[model samples]
Target chain A: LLGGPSVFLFPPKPKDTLMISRTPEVTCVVVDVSHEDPEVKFNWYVDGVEVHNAKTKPREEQYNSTYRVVSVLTVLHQDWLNGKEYKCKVSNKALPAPIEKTISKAKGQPREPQVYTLPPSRDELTKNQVSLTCLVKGFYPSDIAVEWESNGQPENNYKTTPPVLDSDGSFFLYSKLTVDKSRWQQGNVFSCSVMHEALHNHYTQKSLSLS
Target chain B: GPSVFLFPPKPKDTLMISRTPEVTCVVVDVSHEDPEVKFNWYVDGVEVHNAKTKPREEQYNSTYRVVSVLTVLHQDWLNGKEYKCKVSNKALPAPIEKTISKAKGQPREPQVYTLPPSRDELTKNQVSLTCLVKGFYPSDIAVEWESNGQPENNYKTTPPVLDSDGSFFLYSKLTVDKSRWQQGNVFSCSVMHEALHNHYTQKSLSLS
Candidate 1:
């Protein structure tokens, strides 16, 4: 009796994310629950009818030296259009009472942004400063930070404008950094690093030098 | 190296002995869709499916994972039989099956049946030693003779023999050196098979 059924993790995280990508021909909907304990069993229902295509597996990890599992339920875009009530009754030996979690609305995979750098075109004789711009366009979720380095050293003289929403709800980001024209003329390298939950952090840098 | 020759791997599964006392082995798996991929449960070659499996075409994604599960009773498994799980996907040339034998009543360390109590004078000088290896299945096995420490090279083997029930029998013979035999140094047989927990099994013969 070393294990007390008293300990458990129930109602884990709220409203798991589902996705409906691709053409709206009802071809894009997907039921995507990736994490579950093997020892726990669950069933899927949409409008109280069993979702035949739903599948579960213990996410190949031990939960406290105990078994665990995972499952994925796939839905079609037409089904998503139903806007039906979908719920899963998850059961496990440890829980005093089995709890249910709802599968909320599906979301699109974040769109890849169109990116470019705008090095100031204004001529050398009149301006002592060079303007470097990083433009990330038409991507969801506005929170972004850019990492800029000049000639491999941390140069912080920069300003990033708040993202502006486009007609389709995606955002446009303009990050600008200014440094002395001398540094730009020396062929100093400049880089912009962007971060997003939908995106991984390792940034690919574009250094369009100030010509 | 040819693409046509490569077979798509069958679905992977697991067997869990349930908490019940009357012997239950719960087997479960998830395989991606290919209408050809079917899950069948066999206990001693007898299909014991009670219609508790999920459908095969259960996804929209090309690489969809379909979950299937079956429960096997001890009455079938404990009776010295074999169980198999097969997957039939079009990516393969033929229906593929993976089998796991019952885990108990055998598969132990090789049981040693020492040399015959009374040997005729002619064979006595050669110190004839017979190692009888029992309790394995489906014909994959290994039994080697070791003298003192190093593997003894000269030994005769029978084609992996089968018992009346589904289990297997392997008979290996080694002609022990008579001087070493009389001096009481032990001779042993080592076995390798799919069943046992440890890959190594041994049996020994000594005067003591």
Candidate 2:
């Protein structure tokens, strides 16, 4: 008898600057059958190709009278962001066929963020400052990171509002970056970068420039 | 007189197999001001004869929609022949075309979930059983209800709705007298999908 489930995930670190970390390591775990026989085999595959760089723990005897073993596959973050299918095959002589379980980010079908930027109003030029508004909409789960950059450098003078529910069950947010009137008049490029679970390694951004 | 025409169908406009053995092409939200438009169907690049086309006004919007359906032989569809729908109007310069074909890969199985009647409904004289079938590909599925091994005929099933992952989900509900439920009668939701082959998946719930 075989019974188990599997998942591919990246362990979180405290110093992870953004909502999505770039530590670049993913781990796949499969806990296979608890049976009298401690002898069991486990195989991992990425995109249907067999993976050899995995470790299996020695079977442990439980007080309830069954043996439990766990197998893990350490993977690169690129495989996860690319939505490559990872499969774990558990084999035993008692089973007619190998119990195979597959996991991939593609199957989740998360909605990506749509980014738009509203140009700064010229009426604020009299105050020696301008506010550039970035509208991020139509995303799910609402755990997103928004950043403002001016002239290719990260800027801290920005305020991102909490997510607001939209009519279509998705979330929308507004991020405003305050810049000096001199920077606005000089045609410096201002960009709003957004990161969500649905995005790949790179963030999706909208840039506005008078140039 | 000059002959003006509307724009060709965009890439997003597509075809679907809403029902088994029939391919439906829905051209949605065409402007109400456009002159009468005609829908044509084609199979394997040749025009198909006797295809049914229907135009209906939208409920809230001033726009209208055109639905065209072409019944195909099950064997031909199973063989994966291409089907195309072309829409034309005098208000446009060219006809809009949407193409579809049967999937060649193995059908994805649907997950079945059954919900029993709520406590408030049990206190009344009637209760409703709900069956939600989700995450299936190809969109061809049938749902039925059974009471203690006996088939039930009185039930309502909604059309399949498309999911973001290209799979489909649908809901079926059966209402029965609370007395029957109080009697500890077992109710089951039976689902028939192509992925299941000869066997159907069933989920049962009961008070007792």
Candidate 3:
């Protein structure tokens, strides 16, 4: 009477982000889960069948009284890059063992960017300071984003440098814009935009026209 | 900018889910300075407030506010389903939860490029003009310069970077004196985002 009678509880797994979009019709595979008990049950598959076409939703939120759910899956980026696989399954008894989420295409494509720019400081200009450096190398799953638009006026001041890890791990970043030197002594036009996710999320900019 | 005056009418400033329609009910005003805060609103854990949801109390003297409004659908806030807003007082050593969703990244209208094609090798009269403005979105945009059309205030802007693909890159610079940029002069690079309000995205340059 002591081989299997402790309770059973075992459902806790599924925290993911798999995105692909270059216009394959909003391709996606996203799953996030946490359970305290809501009679858990979420299922969606793509390459192994059991798929219900798409758009499967279950969201009930609570943190103190217990229970949580976030299940989302919408597949197609040519169907997970033709290699096939997109799953987010979870069953419950309190989960003795049922929480699986697997998204394929090597986790979500992204690696096509190598930008560099450095304009700001022509012997200090007198100290008006015109700092501008947009350097971003390689990319991966760090979920990237960088912005700046001046002249037409869309500048938030600038400061973004938090993705350093490139010996090969992929993820290099930079965004520093300290302008006032009449926007490069008076040319006016500075742009540095680079986006990863292998062009699925779409965005690649590198503009520098001070005039 | 704490100008609520007597501050009486406080609630629902802008919980604007702006672009979503499948299910909606988002009323949120969570302002805390920690003094005796108590608020709870859930959906996935099953809890009701007399009926469904209600918690509104606002005072702008000590800044301890809490207001919740939730009853969603729109495909679970666009497949990003997760909503919980809990708050307790005493600086929150325990109760303080917030997870509202409605952003899967999709607001674009910016893809510009104007770099080193020919600056004519200016090393004398001085020339510098950069206006990148890459991959756009609701990331607030307006990248400019206009030579004969009026609008060039010594220009210098760059603080809109968040593009790993979510779209948004900033660039603005102005430095031209070479006889008003010699030759012809008509420089232009204009854009104001919200995904083109009446269509506005002009990229121009006149001197390289």
Interface RMSD of each: 42.8, 21.4, 11.4
Report the lDDT tens digits of candidate 2 across residue range B96-115. Answer: 87777765666788777665
Retained true contacts (fraction), each candidate: 0.00, 0.00, 0.03
Q: Which candidate number has the best DockQ?
A: 3
lDDT string for model 3 (B10-117, tens) is: 111111244323222222233444334444655455553522334545565545344434445434443445556565544434655655454456766665544321
Better of 1 and 2 by lDDT: 2
Better of 1 and 3 by DockQ: 3
lDDT at position A130, candidate 3 = 53
TM-score of chain A of each: 0.46, 0.51, 0.29
Candidate 1 wrongly placed segments (more than 4 Å): A1-108, A123-125, A198-202, B1-208
In candidate 1, what are the lDDT values of residues B99-159, reduced to their tens digit? 6554455443333333321223234445445565544554555678886688987565555
Model 2 off-target regions past 4 Å? A1-211, B1-20, B25-38, B53-68, B78-80, B102-104, B111-135, B146-177, B198-203
The global Cα lDDT (0 to 1) of model 2 is 0.64
TM-scores of chain B alone in all candidate structures, in the order given: 0.46, 0.58, 0.26
**Residue B52 accuracy (lDDT) in model 2:** 72
Please, what is the TM-score per model?
0.25, 0.36, 0.30
Candidates by TM-score, descending order: 2, 3, 1
Ranking by DockQ: 3, 2, 1
TM-score of 3: 0.30
Considering only chain B, report the TM-score of model 3: 0.26
Docking class of 3: incorrect
